Coordinates of N, CA and C and ligand atoms in Angstrom, one line a residue:
X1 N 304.9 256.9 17.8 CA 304.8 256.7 19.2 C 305.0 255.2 19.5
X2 N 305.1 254.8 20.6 CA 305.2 253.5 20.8 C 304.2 252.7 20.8
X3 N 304.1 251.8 20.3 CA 302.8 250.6 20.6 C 303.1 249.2 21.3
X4 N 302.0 248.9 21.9 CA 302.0 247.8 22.8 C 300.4 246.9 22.4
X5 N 300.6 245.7 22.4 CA 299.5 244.4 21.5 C 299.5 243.5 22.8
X6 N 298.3 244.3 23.3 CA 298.0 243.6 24.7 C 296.7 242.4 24.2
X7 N 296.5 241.5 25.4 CA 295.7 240.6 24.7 C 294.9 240.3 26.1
X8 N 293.6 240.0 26.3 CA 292.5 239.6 27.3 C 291.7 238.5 26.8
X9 N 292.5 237.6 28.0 CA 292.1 236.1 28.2 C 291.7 235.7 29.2
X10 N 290.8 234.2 29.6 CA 290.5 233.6 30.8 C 288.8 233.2 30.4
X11 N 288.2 232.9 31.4 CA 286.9 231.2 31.1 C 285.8 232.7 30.5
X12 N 284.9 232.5 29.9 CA 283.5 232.7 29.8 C 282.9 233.1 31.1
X13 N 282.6 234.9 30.3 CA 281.6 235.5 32.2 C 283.0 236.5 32.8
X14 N 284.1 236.0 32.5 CA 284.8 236.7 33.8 C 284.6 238.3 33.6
X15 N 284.8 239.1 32.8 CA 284.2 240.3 32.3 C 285.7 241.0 31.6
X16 N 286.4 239.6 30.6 CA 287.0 240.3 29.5 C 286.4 241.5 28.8
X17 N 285.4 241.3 27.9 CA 285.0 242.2 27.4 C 284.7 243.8 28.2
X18 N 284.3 243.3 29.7 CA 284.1 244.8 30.4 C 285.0 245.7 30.8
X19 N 286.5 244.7 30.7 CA 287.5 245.4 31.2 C 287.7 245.8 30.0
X20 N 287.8 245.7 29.0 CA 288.3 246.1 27.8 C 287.7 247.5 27.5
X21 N 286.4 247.4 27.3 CA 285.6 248.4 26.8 C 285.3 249.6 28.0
X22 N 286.0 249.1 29.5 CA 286.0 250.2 30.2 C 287.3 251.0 29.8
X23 N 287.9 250.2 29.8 CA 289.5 250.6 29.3 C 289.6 251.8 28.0
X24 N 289.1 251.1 27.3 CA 288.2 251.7 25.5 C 287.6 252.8 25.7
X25 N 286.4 252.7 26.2 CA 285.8 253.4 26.0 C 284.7 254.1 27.1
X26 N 285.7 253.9 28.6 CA 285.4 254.5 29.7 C 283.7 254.4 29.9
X27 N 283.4 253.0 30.1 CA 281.9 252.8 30.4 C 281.8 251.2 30.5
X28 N 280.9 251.3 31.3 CA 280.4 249.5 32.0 C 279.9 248.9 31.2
X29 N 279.7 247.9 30.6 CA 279.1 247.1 29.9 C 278.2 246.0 30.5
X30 N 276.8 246.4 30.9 CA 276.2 245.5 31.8 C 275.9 243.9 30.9
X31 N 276.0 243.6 29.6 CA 276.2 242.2 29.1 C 276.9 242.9 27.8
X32 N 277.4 242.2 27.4 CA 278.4 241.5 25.9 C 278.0 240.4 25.2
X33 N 277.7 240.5 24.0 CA 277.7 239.4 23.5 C 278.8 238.6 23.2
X34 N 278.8 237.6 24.3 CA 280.2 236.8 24.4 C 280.7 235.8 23.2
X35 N 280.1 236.0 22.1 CA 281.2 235.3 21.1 C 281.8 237.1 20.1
X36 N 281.7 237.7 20.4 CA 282.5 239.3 20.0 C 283.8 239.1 20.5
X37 N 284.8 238.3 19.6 CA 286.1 238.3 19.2 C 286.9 240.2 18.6
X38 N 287.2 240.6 19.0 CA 287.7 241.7 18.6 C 289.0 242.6 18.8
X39 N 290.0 243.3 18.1 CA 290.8 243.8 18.6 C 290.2 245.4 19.0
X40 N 290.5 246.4 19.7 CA 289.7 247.7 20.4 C 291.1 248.6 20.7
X41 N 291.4 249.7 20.0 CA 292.3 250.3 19.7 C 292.2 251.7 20.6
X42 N 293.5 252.1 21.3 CA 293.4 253.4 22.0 C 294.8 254.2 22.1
X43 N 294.6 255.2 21.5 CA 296.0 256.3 22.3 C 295.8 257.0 23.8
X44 N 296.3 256.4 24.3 CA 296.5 256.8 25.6 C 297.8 257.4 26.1
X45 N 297.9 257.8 27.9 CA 299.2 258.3 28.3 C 299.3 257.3 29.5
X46 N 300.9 256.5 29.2 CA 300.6 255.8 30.3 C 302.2 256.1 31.0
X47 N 302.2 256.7 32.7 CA 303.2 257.1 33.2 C 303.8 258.6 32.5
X48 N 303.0 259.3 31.6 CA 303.5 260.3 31.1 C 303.7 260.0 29.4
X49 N 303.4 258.3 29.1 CA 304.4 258.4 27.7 C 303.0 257.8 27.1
X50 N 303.1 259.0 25.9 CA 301.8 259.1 24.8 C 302.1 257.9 23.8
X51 N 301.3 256.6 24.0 CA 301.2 255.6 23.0 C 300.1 254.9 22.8
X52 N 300.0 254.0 22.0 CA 298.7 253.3 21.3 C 298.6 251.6 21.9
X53 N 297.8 251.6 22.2 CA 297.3 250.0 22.8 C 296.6 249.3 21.7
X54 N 296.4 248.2 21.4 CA 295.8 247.5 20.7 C 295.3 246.2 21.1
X55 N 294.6 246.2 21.8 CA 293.9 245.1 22.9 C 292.9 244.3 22.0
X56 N 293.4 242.7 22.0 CA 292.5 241.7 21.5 C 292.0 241.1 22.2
X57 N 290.2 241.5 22.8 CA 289.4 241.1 23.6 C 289.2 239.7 23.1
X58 N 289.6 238.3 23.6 CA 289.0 237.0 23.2 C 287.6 236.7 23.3
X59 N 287.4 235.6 22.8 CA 286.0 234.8 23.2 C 286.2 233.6 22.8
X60 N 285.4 232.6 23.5 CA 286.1 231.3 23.6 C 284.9 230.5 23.2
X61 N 296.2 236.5 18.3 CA 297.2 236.0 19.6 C 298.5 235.9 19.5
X62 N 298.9 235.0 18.5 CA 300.8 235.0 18.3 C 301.7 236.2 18.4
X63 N 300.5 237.1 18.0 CA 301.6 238.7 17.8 C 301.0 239.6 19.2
X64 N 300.1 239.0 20.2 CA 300.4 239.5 21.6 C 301.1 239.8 22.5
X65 N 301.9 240.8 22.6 CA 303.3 241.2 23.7 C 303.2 241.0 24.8
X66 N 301.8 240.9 25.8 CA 301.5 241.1 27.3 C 300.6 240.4 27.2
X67 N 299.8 240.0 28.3 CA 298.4 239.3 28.7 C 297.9 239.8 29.9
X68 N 296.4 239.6 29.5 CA 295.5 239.9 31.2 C 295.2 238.4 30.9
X69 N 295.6 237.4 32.4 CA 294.6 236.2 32.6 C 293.8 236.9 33.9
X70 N 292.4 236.3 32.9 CA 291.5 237.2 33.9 C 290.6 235.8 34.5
X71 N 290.2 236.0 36.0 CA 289.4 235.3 36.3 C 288.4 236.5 37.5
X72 N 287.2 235.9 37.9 CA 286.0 236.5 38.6 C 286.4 235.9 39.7
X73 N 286.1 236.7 40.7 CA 286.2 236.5 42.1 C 285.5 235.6 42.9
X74 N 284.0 235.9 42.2 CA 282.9 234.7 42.8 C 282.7 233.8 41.7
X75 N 283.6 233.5 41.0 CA 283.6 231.7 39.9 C 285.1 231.3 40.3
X76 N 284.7 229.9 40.7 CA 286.1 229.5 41.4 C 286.5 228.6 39.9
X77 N 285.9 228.0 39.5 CA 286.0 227.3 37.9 C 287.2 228.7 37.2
X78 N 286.6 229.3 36.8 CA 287.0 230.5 36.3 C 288.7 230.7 36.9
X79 N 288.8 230.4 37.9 CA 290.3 230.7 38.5 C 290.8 229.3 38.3
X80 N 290.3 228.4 38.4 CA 291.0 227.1 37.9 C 291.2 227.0 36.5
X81 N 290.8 227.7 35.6 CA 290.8 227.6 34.2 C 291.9 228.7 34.1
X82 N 292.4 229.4 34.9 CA 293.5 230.6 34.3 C 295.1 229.5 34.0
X83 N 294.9 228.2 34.7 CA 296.3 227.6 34.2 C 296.4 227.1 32.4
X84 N 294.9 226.5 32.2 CA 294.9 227.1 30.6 C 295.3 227.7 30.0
X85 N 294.7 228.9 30.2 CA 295.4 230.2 29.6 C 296.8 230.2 29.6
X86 N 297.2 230.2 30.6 CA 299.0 230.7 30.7 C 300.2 229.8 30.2
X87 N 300.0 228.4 29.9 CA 300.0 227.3 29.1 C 299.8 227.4 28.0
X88 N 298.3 228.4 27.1 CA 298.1 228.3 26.0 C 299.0 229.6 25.6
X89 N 299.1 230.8 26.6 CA 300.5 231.6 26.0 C 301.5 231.4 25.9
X90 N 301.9 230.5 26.9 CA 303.7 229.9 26.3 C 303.9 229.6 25.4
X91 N 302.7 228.5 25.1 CA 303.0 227.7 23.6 C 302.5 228.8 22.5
X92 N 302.2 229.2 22.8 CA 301.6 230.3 21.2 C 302.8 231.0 21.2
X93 N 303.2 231.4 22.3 CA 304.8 232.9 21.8 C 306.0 231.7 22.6
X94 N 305.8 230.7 22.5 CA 306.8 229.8 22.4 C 307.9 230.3 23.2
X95 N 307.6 230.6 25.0 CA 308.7 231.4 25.5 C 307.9 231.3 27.2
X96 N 308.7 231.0 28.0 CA 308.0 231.7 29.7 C 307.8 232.5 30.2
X97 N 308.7 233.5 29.3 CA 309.1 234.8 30.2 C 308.0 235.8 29.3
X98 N 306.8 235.1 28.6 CA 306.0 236.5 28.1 C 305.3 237.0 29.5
X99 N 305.2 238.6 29.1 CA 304.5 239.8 30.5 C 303.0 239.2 30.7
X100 N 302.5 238.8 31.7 CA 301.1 239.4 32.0 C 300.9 239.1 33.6
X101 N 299.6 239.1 33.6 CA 299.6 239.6 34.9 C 298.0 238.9 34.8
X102 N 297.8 238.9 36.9 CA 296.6 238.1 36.8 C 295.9 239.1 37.2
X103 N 294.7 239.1 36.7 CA 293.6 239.7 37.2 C 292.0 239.1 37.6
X104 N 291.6 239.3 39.1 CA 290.9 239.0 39.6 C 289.4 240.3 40.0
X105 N 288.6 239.8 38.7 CA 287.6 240.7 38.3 C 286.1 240.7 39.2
X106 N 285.5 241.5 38.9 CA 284.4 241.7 40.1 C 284.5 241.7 41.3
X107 N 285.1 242.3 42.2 CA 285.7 242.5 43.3 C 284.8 243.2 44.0
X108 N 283.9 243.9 43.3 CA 282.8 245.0 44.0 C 282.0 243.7 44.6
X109 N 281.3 242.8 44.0 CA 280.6 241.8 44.7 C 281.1 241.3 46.1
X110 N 280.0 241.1 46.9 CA 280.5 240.3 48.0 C 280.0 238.4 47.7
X111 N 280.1 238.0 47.0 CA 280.1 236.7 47.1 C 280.9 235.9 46.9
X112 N 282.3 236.1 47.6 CA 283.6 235.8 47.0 C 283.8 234.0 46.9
X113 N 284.1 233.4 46.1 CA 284.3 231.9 46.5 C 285.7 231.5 45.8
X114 N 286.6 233.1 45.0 CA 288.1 232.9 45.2 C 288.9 233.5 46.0
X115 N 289.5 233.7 47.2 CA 290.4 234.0 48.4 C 291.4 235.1 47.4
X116 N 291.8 235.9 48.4 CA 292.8 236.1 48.4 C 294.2 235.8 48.6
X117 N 294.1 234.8 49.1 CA 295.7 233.6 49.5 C 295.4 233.0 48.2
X118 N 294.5 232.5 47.6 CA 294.1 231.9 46.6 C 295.0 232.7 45.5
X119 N 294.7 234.0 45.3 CA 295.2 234.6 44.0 C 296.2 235.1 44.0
X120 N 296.9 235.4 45.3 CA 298.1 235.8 45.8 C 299.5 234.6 45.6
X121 N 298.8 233.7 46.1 CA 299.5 232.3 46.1 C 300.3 232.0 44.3
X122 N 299.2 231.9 43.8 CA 299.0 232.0 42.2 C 300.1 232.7 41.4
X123 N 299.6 233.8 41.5 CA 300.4 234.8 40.9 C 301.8 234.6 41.5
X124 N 301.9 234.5 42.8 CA 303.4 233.7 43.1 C 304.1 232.4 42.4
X125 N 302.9 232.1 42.4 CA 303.7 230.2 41.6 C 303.7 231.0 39.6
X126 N 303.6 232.1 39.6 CA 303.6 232.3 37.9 C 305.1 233.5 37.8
X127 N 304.9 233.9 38.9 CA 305.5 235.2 39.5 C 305.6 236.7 38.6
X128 N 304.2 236.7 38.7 CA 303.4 238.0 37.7 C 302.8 238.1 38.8
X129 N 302.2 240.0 38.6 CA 301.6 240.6 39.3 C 300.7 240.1 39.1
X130 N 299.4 240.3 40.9 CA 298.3 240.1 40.7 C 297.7 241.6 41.5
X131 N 296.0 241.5 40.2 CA 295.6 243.1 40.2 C 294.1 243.2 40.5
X132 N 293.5 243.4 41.4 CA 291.9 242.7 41.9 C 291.4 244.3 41.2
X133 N 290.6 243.9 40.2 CA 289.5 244.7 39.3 C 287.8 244.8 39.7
X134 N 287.1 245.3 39.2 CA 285.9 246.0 39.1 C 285.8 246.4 37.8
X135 N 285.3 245.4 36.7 CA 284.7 246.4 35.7 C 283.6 247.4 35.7
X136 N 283.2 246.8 36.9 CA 281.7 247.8 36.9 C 281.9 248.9 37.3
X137 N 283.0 249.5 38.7 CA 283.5 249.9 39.4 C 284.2 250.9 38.6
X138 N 284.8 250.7 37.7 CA 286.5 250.6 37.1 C 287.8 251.2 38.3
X139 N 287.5 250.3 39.2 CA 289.0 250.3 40.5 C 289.5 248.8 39.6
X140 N 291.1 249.5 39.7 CA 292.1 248.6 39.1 C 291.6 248.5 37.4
X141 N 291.4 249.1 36.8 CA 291.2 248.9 35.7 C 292.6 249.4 34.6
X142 N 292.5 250.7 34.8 CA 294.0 251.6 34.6 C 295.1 250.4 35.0
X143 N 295.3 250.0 36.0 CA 296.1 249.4 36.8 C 296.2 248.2 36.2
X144 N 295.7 246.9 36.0 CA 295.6 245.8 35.4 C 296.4 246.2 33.8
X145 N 295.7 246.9 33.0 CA 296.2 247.0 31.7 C 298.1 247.4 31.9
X146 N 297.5 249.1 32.4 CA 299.5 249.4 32.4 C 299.7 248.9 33.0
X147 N 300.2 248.1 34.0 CA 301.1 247.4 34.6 C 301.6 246.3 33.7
X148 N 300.6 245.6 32.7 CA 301.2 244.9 32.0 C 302.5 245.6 31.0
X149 N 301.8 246.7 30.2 CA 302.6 247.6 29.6 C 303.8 248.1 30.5
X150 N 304.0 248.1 31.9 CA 305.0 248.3 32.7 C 305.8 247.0 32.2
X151 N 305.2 246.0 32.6 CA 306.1 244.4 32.1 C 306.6 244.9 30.7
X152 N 306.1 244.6 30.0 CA 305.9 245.0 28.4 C 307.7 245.4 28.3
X153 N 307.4 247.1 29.0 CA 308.2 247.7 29.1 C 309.6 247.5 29.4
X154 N 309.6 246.4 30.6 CA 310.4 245.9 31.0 C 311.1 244.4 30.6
X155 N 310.3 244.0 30.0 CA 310.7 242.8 28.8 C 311.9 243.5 27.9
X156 N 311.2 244.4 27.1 CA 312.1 245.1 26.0 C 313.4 245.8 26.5
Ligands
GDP1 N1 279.3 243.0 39.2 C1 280.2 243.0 38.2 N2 279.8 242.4 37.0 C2 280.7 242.4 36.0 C3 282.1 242.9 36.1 N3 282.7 242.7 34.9 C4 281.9 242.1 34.1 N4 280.7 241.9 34.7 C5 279.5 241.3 34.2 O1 279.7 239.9 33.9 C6 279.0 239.5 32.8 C7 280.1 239.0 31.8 O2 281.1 240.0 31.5 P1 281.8 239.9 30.0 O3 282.7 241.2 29.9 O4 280.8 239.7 28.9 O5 282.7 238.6 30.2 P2 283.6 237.9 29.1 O6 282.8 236.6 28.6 O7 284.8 237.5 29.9 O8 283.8 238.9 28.0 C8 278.3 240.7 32.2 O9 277.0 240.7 32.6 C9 279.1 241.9 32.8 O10 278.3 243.1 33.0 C10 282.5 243.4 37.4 O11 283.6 243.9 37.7 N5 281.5 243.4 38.4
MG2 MG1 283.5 238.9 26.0
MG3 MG1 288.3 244.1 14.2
MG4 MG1 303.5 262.9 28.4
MG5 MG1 287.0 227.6 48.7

């Protein structure tokens, strides 16, 4: 079947690890021990087509196809730190045109101090989808991963 080597990145707190393990293994992770470097393996169906994901949750690569840059809604730091990331993926896959997509996590909270012109804008100046998540929630969760695998898809 086909496989896809997705990779989750962005600052400390944003809730890499929650998106992952909701993704994994369909449940909230109310804390992570955030130095848990790991890859988290799944057969799933995405759009109808039965394949295998291989997601390298970071903690703070070369053979990554796609990316989540993830930042939190209420850490505005956290959204300034996603141009790291997307800089540290060019140069590792040595290329502009690698798939990912931004994602703007904790969305259930109301204490927002990143905009939505804010992450819309963004995602425009990168010109990748942007995907407002809830790990706790899991709204956009499904949605953040495949979509990348949609890119993915459409890379190839
Ligand atoms: N309210 C809320 N909290 C979240 C969400 N995602 C992660 N968290 C929490 O934020 C903290 C950090 O998440 P974690 O996945 O460890 O972040 P990481 O360092 O990026 O892996 C944890 O206490 C999580 O339960 C979310 O969507 N909403
Ligand atoms: Mg983590
Ligand atoms: Mg391992
Ligand atoms: Mg099918
Ligand atoms: Mg502001």
């Amino acid at each position: 079947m086909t496989e896809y080597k997705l990779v989750v990145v962005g600052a400390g707190g944003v809730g890499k690890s929650a998106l992952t393990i909701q993704l994994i293994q369909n449940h909230f992770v109310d804390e992570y021990d955030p130095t848990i470097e790991d890859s988290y393996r799944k057969q799933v169906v995405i759009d109808g087509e039965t394949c295998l994901l291989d997601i390298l949750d970071t903690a703070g690569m070369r053979t990554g196809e796609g990316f989540l840059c993830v930042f939190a809604i209420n850490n505005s730091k956290s959204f300034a730190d996603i141009n790291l990331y997307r800089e540290q993926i060019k140069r590792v896959k040595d290329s502009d045109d690698v798939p990912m997509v931004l994602v703007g996590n904790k969305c259930d909270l109301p204490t927002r101090t990143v905009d939505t012109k804010q992450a819309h804008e963004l995602a425009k100046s990168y010109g990748i989808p942007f995907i407002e998540t809830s790990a706790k929630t899991r709204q956009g969760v499904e949605d953040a991963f495949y979509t990348l695998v949609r890119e993915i898809r459409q890379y190839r």
